[PDB]
Amino acid sequence: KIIINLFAPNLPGSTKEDDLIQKSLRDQLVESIRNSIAYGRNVFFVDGTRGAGKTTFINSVVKSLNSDQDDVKVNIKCLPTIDPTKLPRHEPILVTVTARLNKMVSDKLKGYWASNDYRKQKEQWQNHLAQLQRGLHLLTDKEYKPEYFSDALKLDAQLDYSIGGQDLSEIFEELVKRACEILDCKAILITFDDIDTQFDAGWDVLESIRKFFNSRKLVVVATGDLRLYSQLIRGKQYENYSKTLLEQEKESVRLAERGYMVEHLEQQYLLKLFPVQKRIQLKTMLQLVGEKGKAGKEEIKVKTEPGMQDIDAIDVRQAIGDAVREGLNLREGSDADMYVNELLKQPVRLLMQVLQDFYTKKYHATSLSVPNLLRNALYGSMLSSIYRAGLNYEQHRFGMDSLCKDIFTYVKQDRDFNTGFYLRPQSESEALRNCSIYLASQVSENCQGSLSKFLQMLLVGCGSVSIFNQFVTELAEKFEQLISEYVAYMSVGRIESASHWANRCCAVVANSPNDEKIGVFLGMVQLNRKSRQHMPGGYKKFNIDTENGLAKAAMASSLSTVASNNLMDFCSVFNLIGAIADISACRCERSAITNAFNKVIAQTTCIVPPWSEATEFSDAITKVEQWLKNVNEIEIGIRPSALLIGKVWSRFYFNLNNVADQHKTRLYRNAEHGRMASQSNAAKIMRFNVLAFLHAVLVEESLYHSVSDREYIGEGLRLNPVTSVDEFEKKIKIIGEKLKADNKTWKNTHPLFFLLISCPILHPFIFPVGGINCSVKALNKETSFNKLIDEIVGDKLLSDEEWDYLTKNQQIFQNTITSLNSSTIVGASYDKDTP
Amino acid sequence: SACRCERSAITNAFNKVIAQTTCIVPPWSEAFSDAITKVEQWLKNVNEIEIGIRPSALLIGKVWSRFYFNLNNVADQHKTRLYRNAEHGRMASQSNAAKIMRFNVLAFLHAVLVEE
Ligand SMILES: Nc1ncnc2c1ncn2[C@@H]1O[C@H](COP(=O)(O)OP(=O)(O)OP(=O)(O)O)[C@@H](O)[C@H]1O
Numbered sequence: 001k002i003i004i005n006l007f008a009p010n011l012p013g014s015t016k017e018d019d020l021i022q023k024s025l026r027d028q029l030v031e032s033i034r035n036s037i038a039y040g041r042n043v044f045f046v047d048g049t050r051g052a053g054k055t056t057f058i059n060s061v062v063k064s065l066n067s068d069q070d071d072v073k074v075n076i077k078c079l080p081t082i083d084p085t086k087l088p089r090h091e092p093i094l095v096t097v098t099a100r101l102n103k104m105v106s107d108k109l110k111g112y113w114a115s116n117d118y119r120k121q122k123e124q125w126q127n128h129l130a131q132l133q134r135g136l137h138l139l140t141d142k143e144y145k146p147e148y149f150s151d152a153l154k155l156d157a158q159l160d161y162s163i164g165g166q167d168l169s170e171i172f173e174e175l176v177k178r179a180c181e182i183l184d185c186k187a188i189l190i191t192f193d194d195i196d197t198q199f200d201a202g203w204d205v206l207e208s209i210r211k212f213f214n215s216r217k218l219v220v221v222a223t224g225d226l227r228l229y230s231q232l233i234r235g236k237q238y239e240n241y242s243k244t245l246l247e248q249e250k251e252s253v254r255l256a257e258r259g260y261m262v263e264h265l266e267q268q269y270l271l272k273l274f275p276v277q278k279r280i281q282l283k284t285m286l287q288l289v290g291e292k293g294k295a296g297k298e299e300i301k302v303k304t305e306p307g308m309q310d311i312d313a314i315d316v317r318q319a320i321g322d323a324v325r326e327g328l329n330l331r332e333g334s335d336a337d338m339y340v341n342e343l344l345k346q347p348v349r350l351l352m353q354v355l356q357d358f359y360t361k362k363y364h365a366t367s368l369s370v371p372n373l374l375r376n377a378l379y380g381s382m383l384s385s386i387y388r389a390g391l392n393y394e395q396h397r398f399g400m401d402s403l404c405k406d407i408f409t410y411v412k413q414d415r416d417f418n419t420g421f422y423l424r425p426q427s428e429s430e431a432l433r434n435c436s437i438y439l440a441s442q443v444s445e446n447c448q449g450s451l452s453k454f455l456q457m458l459l460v461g462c463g464s465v466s467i468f469n470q471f472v473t474e475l476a477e478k479f480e481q482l483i484s485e486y487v488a489y490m491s492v493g494r495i496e497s498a499s500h501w502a503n504r505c506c507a508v509v510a511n512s513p514n515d516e517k518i519g520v521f522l523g524m525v526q527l528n529r530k531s532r533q534h535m536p537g538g539y540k541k542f543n544i545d546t547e548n549g550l551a552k553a554a555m556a557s558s559l560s561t562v563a564s565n566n567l568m569d570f571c572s573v574f575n576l577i578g579a580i581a582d583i584s585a586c587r588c589e590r591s592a593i594t595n596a597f598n599k600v601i602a603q604t605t606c607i608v609p610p611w612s613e614a615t616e617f618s619d620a621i622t623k624v625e626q627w628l629k630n631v632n633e634i635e636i637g638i639r640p641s642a643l644l645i646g647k648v649w650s651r652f653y654f655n656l657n658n659v660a661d662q663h664k665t666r667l668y669r670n671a672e673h674g675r676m677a678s679q680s681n682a683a684k685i686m687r688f689n690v691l692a693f694l695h696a697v698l699v700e701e702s703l704y705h706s707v708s709d710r711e712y713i714g715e716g717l718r719l720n721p722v723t724s725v726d727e728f729e730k731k732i733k734i735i736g737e738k739l740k741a742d743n744k745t746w747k748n749t750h751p752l753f754f755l756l757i758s759c760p761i762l763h764p765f766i767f768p769v770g771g772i773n774c775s776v777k778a779l780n781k782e783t784s785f786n787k788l789i790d791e792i793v794g795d796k797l798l799s800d801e802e803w804d805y806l807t808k809n810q811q812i813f814q815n816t817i818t819s820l821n822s823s824t825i826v827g828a829s830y831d832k833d834t835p
Numbered sequence: 836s837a838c839r840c841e842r843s844a845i846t847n848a849f850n851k852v853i854a855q856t857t858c859i860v861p862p863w864s865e866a867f868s869d870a871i872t873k874v875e876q877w878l879k880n881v882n883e884i885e886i887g888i889r890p891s892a893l894l895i896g897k898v899w900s901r902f903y904f905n906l907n908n909v910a911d912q913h914k915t916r917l918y919r920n921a922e923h924g925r926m927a928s929q930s931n932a933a934k935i936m937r938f939n940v941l942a943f944l945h946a947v948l949v950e951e
């Protein structure tokens with residue numbers, strides 16, 4: 001039963017019983033210490049990294065040994081713990097030990113009453129101390145005076161030392177023996193604190209232990225890190241090599257053999273001092289409480305509130321679980337517990353300061369933004385790792401712009417361009433591992449409570465590194481110059497708008513001239529700006545004026561042109577998504593919504609990246625204004641994570657790869673008004689580009705969104721819709737009834753998909769006139785698809801007569817695209833027809 | 836091979852291994868309801884048998900070595916046996932994609948079998 005009170009100071013000095021994390025080792029060491037005496041140098045080493053609690057451990061060992069020392073068969077007196085870092089820089093350790101030993105002895109003489117025995121054993125003690133003072137210069141001398149030879153040849157004493165000469169260890173050995181007689185103890189414990197704070201001063205501890213602490217009446221307990229003593233020992237065996245030899249034999253053959261010798265003298269210097277059978281490894285908090293399935297060797301509980309009852313105290317893994325899950329907006333499972341495990345493997349001081357800072361402000365805040373509490377808690381603890389890894393550190397500049405830059409500068413060092421945006425604690429280095437949980441808190445804090453910041457992190461944050469894992473990585477110091485150019489061109493960290501990112505993102509996927517020269521790309525299709533001959537069928541140069549209402553608005557938000565030797569023109573889904581990320585940010589006023597469609601269309605000049613060789617429109621605004629009304633009351637309960645945004649991009653990116661190549665072929669002569677799956681056109685590619693985003697959001701919303709604990713897709717193969725709709729239709733059908741079963745609505749369980757499926761900007765792209773897979777029986781799926789969508793959003797996207805025109809083989813369309821199918825894709829050969 | 840052999844978790848874990856996994860090229864590049872049921876008793880046997888598994892470092896290394904070399908021969912001898920007609924056929928002189936992957940799987944079973 002171990003309970004840690006977070007509102008207590010929780011310091012190594014101010015830690016009483018009943019909260020010792022190391023209670024199994026404290027008892028195990030003490031009995032093993034007593035066993036050694038009850039049965040030669042006797043040194044116990046308590047291993048452990050920095051912040052493990054080594055000072056707190058020995059502090060408990062002395063407390064558990066000084067109690068009932070005379071009430072047990074083997075009496076062991078303990079000196080106060082010696083801290084090698086806090087001692088005077090030049091004070092010998094033997095001086096410190098003797099000074100602390102003299103105080104213990106003198107205090108015992110003042111407890112005696114028989115003056116005959118008091119005076120008999122005080123003359124001996126003063127004689128031994130005076131003899132130690134006489135020979136103390138042997139340590140603090142830079143030369144050997146010839147007149148000291150008389151001291152070695154003096155025998156004017158009754159000691160009758162075994163070996164001749166003024167051996168200081170011999171003088172100290174009987175000094176300890178005299179002290180044991182006075183204190184009436186069978187041994188004396190010399191506890192040495194760790195040297196981790198300043199480890200160059202721990203050499204005197206090592207040399208003193210092996211020289212003067214060899215007696216059977218001395219028990220030495222020294223803690224620290226063997227990884228740190230090894231560097232101290234190795235650097236001192238190198239000082240035994242003459243400087244001239246090192247300078248004259250700098251070549252590898254003899255240099256390597258010397259290094260083999262030093263590591264082979266270091267190895268046995270540790271084995272001589274701290275024997276393996278006596279070392280004790282301090283267990284980190286993960287090894288105590290254990291995992292969910294593995295039995296917890298101990299039971300650690302945390303008092304997360306002031307005045308909390310002992311029964312009320314909650315388990316530490318649950319306490320970390322609450323902070324990690326709510327702080328990162330993350331749901332119970334492998335991903336949430338992967339962060340919790342990493343926080344447990346942290347040094348105890350670092351972990352106990354994350355919890356202390358998080359739960360102190362959490363309680364104080366109520367007297368909420370839990371992700372903000374964890375962001376500040378992790379910022380302070382992982383600050384040394386943030387500085388090392390080069391992440392943003394100023395707190396007045398925290399925001400979306402200063403976060404997407406951090407995600408790019410993190411995966412660049414992590415080298416995980418495929419899954420780095422997940423921000424999982426997987427990096428081998430501890431600095432990048434520490435930043436991963438801090439960055440995850442940053443993403444779960446900024447994007448929380450707003451849909452606009454979710455899409456900016458999706459495109460600018462997660463996307464920018466994927467648009468680097470391809471289309472920029474083939475060009476690769478040159479790599480650091482490529483990074484410098486790429487982030488300056490795309491202006492990540494200072495983006496003007498999400499749409500502005502998409503237009504630059506259009507060029508990089510365009511300034512990489514793909515094979516077959518077809519102007520069909522990942523999530524973007526090129527369209528001709530000029531008219532020529534040789535165009536069969538109804539294919540024609542794209543004209544924006546053909547579309548009406550939302551149809552004109554939807555393309556205007558999607559069209560993006562880049563200035564080059566010739567003005568390329570593109571229709572991307574990133575521009576469509578970036579437009580949504582811009583409308584959501586602004587207010588519900590009509591004036592601001594109008595500018596969103598008109599931020600890029602006719603006032604931007606997207607020069608190619610340097611790494612290249614060369615009214616009814618008011619009705620459209622009304623629908624967007626109505627949708628923005630929904631966003632401002634639904635997005636307040638959104639809980640996006642760094643995992644969800646990373647996952648949603650991953651599926652959305654994978655689909656855009658499938659639809660890119662699976663439609664690079666089906667661009668045949670009769671593809672206009674495509675009705676079979678073997679014919680595709682600009683209305684087909686863009687329909688599944690948009691439907692890819694609506695699916696990636698849909699499938700991994702229920703999978704990973706923290707608002708709904710349960711899973712509503714159920715168990716099955718989560719195939720994604722490419723050139724088809726049944727894959728999307730299968731999942732959207734089966735989700736609907738489960739919420740009715742659980743008495744939950746579509747908006748309070750999948751707020752992200754509900755908002756994006758009800759966005760009028762992408763509504764014309766869901767059912768383009770050109771893009772409809774009205775097969776003999778697949779049209780029933782789309783008929784169900786339209787019915788499901790019309791019920792999710794609450795409004796009929798297309799009227800009964802409007803739907804019949806798309807399926808059955810004039811009409812004006814104010815809600816669906818019209819001229820996209822007739823558009824001519826650059827680099828497409830319109831000579832081969834569908835067979 | 837997961838823990839607790841939970842009929843739902845085994846189903847949940849089975850859908851992960853069959854889900855399509857897409858990955859990008861490395862930077863150093865120049866370019867079933869009754870199916871889950873049959874898995875249940877397999878984990879019933881695994882949890883009551885794997886306790887006795889005593890895999891050495893040499894065992895794991897050696898089994899791979901036979902496993903690594905066999906797939907070299909399979910990818911080399913069948914590298915030219917993709918003829919025009921009847922690769923499924925009747926004899927071993929011709930090879931198809933269903934027997935390149937048959938001997939690749941059989942190589943793993945053999946390498947485990949022979950050197951265990
Ligand atoms: N038994 C314990 N109970 C409560 N908190 C503990 C305990 N052990 C360690 N801690 C926490 O971990 C921190 C580290 O303690 P400690 O000073 O012993 O570590 P150290 O870094 O190994 O030692 P040093 O201060 O000598 O460098 C403490 O300040 C405290 O916050």
